[PDB]
Design a binder for this molecule. Structure first.
Ligand SMILES: [Br-]
Ligand SMILES: [Br-]
Ligand SMILES: [Br-]
Ligand SMILES: [Br-]
Ligand SMILES: [Br-]
Ligand SMILES: [Br-]
Ligand SMILES: [Ca+2]
Ligand SMILES: [Ca+2]
Ligand SMILES: [Cl-]
Ligand SMILES: [Cl-]
Ligand SMILES: [Cl-]
Ligand SMILES: [Cl-]
Ligand SMILES: [Cl-]
Ligand SMILES: [Cl-]
Ligand SMILES: [Cl-]
Ligand SMILES: [Cl-]
Ligand SMILES: [Cl-]
Ligand SMILES: [Cl-]
Ligand SMILES: [Cl-]
Ligand SMILES: [Cl-]
Ligand SMILES: [Cl-]
Ligand SMILES: [Cl-]
Lengths: 464, 464
């Protein structure tokens, strides 16, 4: 009997901001209990260090550099199909694949993969959608509904999508509670629906917490009243509210007897933003970086029927693995011609085998005139940040990327740079960029200039 | 009547790495006692976020962008006067000005302002020099002398200058102890020389501690044995050896009865490198950045005859202020046509008045194809890092530069950028650059492109 699949995806959760991954000040007892009863992934990576492209990769199973979606959609992006402001519809999502294999599919919370009808969740493999289409949202309906009406009362032609009414399959959601609590409430409802249907479920629970604005319930803040920094205190309360809902979700799974045969996957979509309450310790950097802190995230698998308790999986994996792993477990057939950049790791997880032995896990982030790069194989990682000289780290011994080994092992450095450059030969042009500056640089050819990105000696050689 | 002047300049000391500036694990009792008995500067800035240009600025009193010295000299730089690898000799150092006013002048420790004879300290106003000409040095003579000899006897043509013999006025120094201790002993020796000559002294004590290589005496490491991280522990021991030497220097000043009429200035030449043991809390960033962490440094003035005890000076100051402050105290006349970018602040310190009201304290750091910028006026700072969109901070309320207010106050942002851009209009071309990549970009005009640096709207506007 095929398992249910529950993906709990948080938004900008820092590497050190759940108990099972080292937090000393944020309490996440429900998440910790799930993690201790499953497999914790100590080297898990998303395919891009910020929101839109990471989510594009999770659902398409491809790097955003291959689908044209490596920039975020701007807020209030176009809602007209003629404008193709969304992930290409030809790139079939794993939700549609699971849907075509008889799964009850549900998407809750944040989307950010296109606000026009052809990009809507109900058209991309989801029987049920409850959430918002853009990149973020205010958390309290009492506050943001008032603002929305008032802004209509002045005929405001550019109302921020952070205050738009949310929707349930295209109709007004009429949410009445702190939206983290509402998304938990909708997850429970959809679990009860699938149980009543005696149908396996796939639920994509995309919390916007703890993404800005930092807004939290008074009852949650009180659990952290001793934290003096206000942003950290509020951020902790936000993470705690997600934890409360996972505990309620777990109770529902047990009452409906779906707990033992549900694969629960929990992760963050990118590294924490350390300007807005997050802590990525012991990693270097912040959301958006190709330092580990940008795209290495907490993650666990929990599936009592098959994954042993107290497991730690220390081999590097990618969020790109979720697509082939889920379609495999679903016994689903892939669409003809579907290209995938990850692999099914369920067997590797059960037997503690290395899925990426002698293979690369990459990141490339476009900047204003240059690219940040990161690439890991085994214990070795190469990094370029700020267009500075290339760095080589033994990421297993130097998790903080403090000791540059490029000088001691230049052969390894250039071999890893060679493979990474070849990878960028397969890229497509971005379907959209983010800023006016971006558009100029790509039109002038100043971007992408992958050739300059993979220079090595001239960055370090003296001309004298 | 005129005071003695002792400049204690550490190398790469982190903002939180002395007791008086908030350190909780590194002990600096001697430095703290001086600071408690003088004026602590809570918003002190050096003129560039790394070694060479900052030091050029301290001795010339000018921004390195105006003297052509905003890149480091490469290690083992040219020793022939013909190649002009050094600070322009026409830019008169404050040591020469003080020399010409009857001061006994002495330089100790690190130089890095040119290794050719016309750039030598003895030709730049220093009666005495004891140290090394380049940018760093190994700490234990038993080890680096052995290496230097072995490699000299093998005719190695590329001996690292980190192991060259140190010198005393052009002759071999024959150092026999941990060079931090060796430098302290020389400061004591030069204090007694000035006393015997019945001359006011100016001592430029340029410790290379706590700059890499992290090397410390075992007896000093033992005092920080509860520090678990090996690099943090050695670094703590290196800072401590500087503190011990400051205490011995203080004892000498009392025996020679020079203590009360000596102005002791203590500061770091730039922010701490957080990859090599330093801690810049609560600032953001690291050595080399235009975040506060790159160029805001600890600093105190200690001068019992005039400066009151337990003072805290909270208005922003610059290390460029030391040149006109010292010559003012020396009652010296400036060379005809000498340009200075700082101001005499001794009166402002004694009366607690604002030296930079409605005026700017700047930083601009060249990167590979773009510029990092920071500029502060009053409570307000603008920051551009990594060519990202411009940031505006109230650094008095937001010392960590976490909350960008550029959207909230675009009028202030644009006026501060306008003033900063006009400042860059006076810059000169670098006399040298640092890497081959640097040279290509400057010859093609890809650098400096100050015009692109001060773009604002195109970095945040959507093109759709
Ligand atoms: Br689809
Ligand atoms: Br709503
Ligand atoms: Br069950
Ligand atoms: Br930010
Ligand atoms: Br001079
Ligand atoms: Br020596
Ligand atoms: Ca995110
Ligand atoms: Ca330095
Ligand atoms: Cl609005
Ligand atoms: Cl940042
Ligand atoms: Cl089992
Ligand atoms: Cl090698
Ligand atoms: Cl384009
Ligand atoms: Cl090259
Ligand atoms: Cl020797
Ligand atoms: Cl050598
Ligand atoms: Cl005295
Ligand atoms: Cl470094
Ligand atoms: Cl760094
Ligand atoms: Cl304003
Ligand atoms: Cl040049
Ligand atoms: Cl502009």
């Amino acid at each position: 009997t095929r398992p249910n699949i529950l993906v709990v995806l948080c938004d900008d959760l820092g590497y050190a901001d759940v108990g099972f991954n080292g937090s000393t000040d944020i309490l996440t007892p429900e998440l910790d209990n799930l993690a201790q009863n499953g497999s914790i992934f100590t080297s898990a990576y998303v395919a891009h260090p910020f929101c839109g492209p990471s989510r594009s990769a999770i659902l398409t199973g491809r790097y955003p550099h291959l689908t044209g979606t490596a920039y975020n959609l701007f807020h209030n992006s176009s809602e007209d199909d003629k404008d193709n402001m969304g992930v290409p519809v030809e790139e079939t999502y794993m939700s549609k694949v699971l849907q075509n294999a008889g799964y009850y599919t549900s998407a809750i919370g944040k989307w950010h993969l296109g606000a026009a009808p052809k990009f809507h969740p109900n058209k991309r493999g989801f029987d049920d959608f409850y959430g918002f289409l853009g990149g973020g949202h205010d958390y309290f309906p009492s506050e943001y509904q008032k603002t929305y009406k008032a802004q209509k009362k002045a005929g405001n032609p550019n109302i921020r999508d952070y205050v738009f009414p949310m929707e349930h399959n295209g109709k007004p959601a009429n949410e009445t509670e702190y939206i983290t609590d509402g998304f938990s409430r909708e997850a429970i409802k959809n679990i009860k629906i699938a149980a009543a249907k005696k149908q396996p479920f796939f639920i994509y629970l995309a919390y916007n917490a703890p993404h800005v604005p930092l807004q939290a319930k008074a009852e949650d803040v009180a659990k952290f009243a001793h934290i003096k920094d206000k942003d950290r205190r509020t951020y902790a309360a936000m993470v705690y509210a997600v934890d409360r809902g996972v505990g309620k979700i777990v109770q529902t799974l047990k009452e409906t007897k779906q707990f033992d045969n549900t694969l629960i996957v929990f992760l963050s979509d990118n590294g924490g933003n350390f300007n807005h309450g997050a802590n990525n310790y012991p990693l270097k950097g912040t959301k958006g970086d190709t330092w580990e802190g940008g795209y290495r995230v907490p993650m666990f698998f929990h599936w009592p029927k098959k994954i042993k308790k107290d497991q730690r999986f220390d081999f590097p994996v990618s969020s790109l693995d979720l697509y082939p792993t889920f379609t495999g477990l679903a016994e689903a057939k892939l669409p003809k011609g579907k290209q995938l950049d990850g692999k099914n790791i369920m067997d590797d997880v059960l037997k503690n085998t290395e899925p990426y032995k002698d293979e690369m896990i990459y990141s490339l982030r476009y900047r204003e005139g240059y690219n940040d790069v990161g690439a890991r194989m085994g214990d070795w990682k190469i990094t370029r940040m700020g267009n500075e000289p290339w760095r080589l780290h033994n990421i297993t011994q130097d998790i903080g990327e403090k000791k540059n080994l490029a000088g001691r092992y230049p052969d390894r450095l250039k071999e890893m740079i060679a493979k990474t450059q070849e990878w960028t030969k397969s890229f497509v042009k971005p379907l959209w960029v983010y800023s006016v500056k971006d558009k100029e640089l790509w039109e002038s050819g100043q971007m992408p200039n992958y050739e300059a990105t993979f220079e090595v000696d001239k960055l370090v050689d003296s001309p004298y």
